[PDB]
Amino acid sequence: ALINPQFPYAGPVPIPGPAPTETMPLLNYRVEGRIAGIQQARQFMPFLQGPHRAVAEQTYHAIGTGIQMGQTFNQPLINTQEG
Amino acid sequence: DKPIYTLQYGNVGFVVNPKTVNQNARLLMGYEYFTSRTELVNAGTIST
Numbered sequence: 787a788l789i790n791p792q793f794p795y796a797g798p799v800p801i802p803g804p805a806p807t808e809t810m811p812l813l814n815y816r817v818e819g820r821i822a823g824i825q826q827a828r829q830f831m832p833f834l835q836g837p838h839r840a841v842a843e844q845t846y847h848a849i850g851t852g853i854q855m856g857q858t859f860n861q862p863l864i865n866t867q868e869g
Numbered sequence: 870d871k872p873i874y875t876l877q878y879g880n881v882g883f884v885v886n887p888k889t890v891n892q893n894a895r896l897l898m899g900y901e902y903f904t905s906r907t908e909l910v911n912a913g914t915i916s917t
Binding site for chain 1 (some may be wrong): 876878911915
């Protein structure tokens with residue numbers, strides 16, 4: 787702010803002001819609020835809580851069976867070298 | 870951003886100063902607003 791003498795800035799907005807209204811009042815709000823609809827315990831989703839496999843491992847079962855059977859052919863006898 | 874809300878700054882009014890007024894003239898006012906009420910504890914429990 788600058789004040790300049792001799793033209794000085796009025797020393798106030800004075801008493802000639804026009805009170806325009808008495809509408810100043812905010813009427814307090816008084817209220818009762820009830821949000822009470824029956825609630826049912828459940829919601830349907832496509833899927834909740836699953837941690838789906840991105841790849842599975844290979845998996846398997848097992849079997850064996852049979853017996854011990856055989857047809858054989860042997861090497862001929864040979865002269866013994868030494869000993 | 871700053872909803873008109875009397876009780877925050879006295880009564881407020883929407884104003885129209887007409888240049889011409891024909892017979893049966895009127896202003897059709899449309900408002901969009903928010904309004905309450907107090908909340909009481911929630912119901913809905915299902916025993917079984």
